[PDB]
Amino acid sequence: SECVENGGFCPDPEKMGDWCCGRCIRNECRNG
C-alpha cells in the first residue's frame, strides 16, 4: 500500500479505491 506522489493519477475511488499521499481528487493525488 504505497501512496502516490502529488500530481499522480488515481483511478475511480468508487471502483478501485482512493490511494494518494494526501487526498485523491479528480483522479489526482493532492497534498497540502
Side-chain angles (χ1 to χ4, degrees):
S1 306
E2 303 308 299
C3 66
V4 191
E5 296 177 75
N6 291 331
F9 184 89
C10 39
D12 281 81
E14 300 299 78
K15 299 295 295 298
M16 288 71 181
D18 62 270
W19 49 301
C20 168
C21 251
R23 295 178 185 177
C24 177
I25 307 177
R26 288 175 53 181
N27 295 98
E28 180 180 273
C29 179
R30 301 181 175 172
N31 180 88

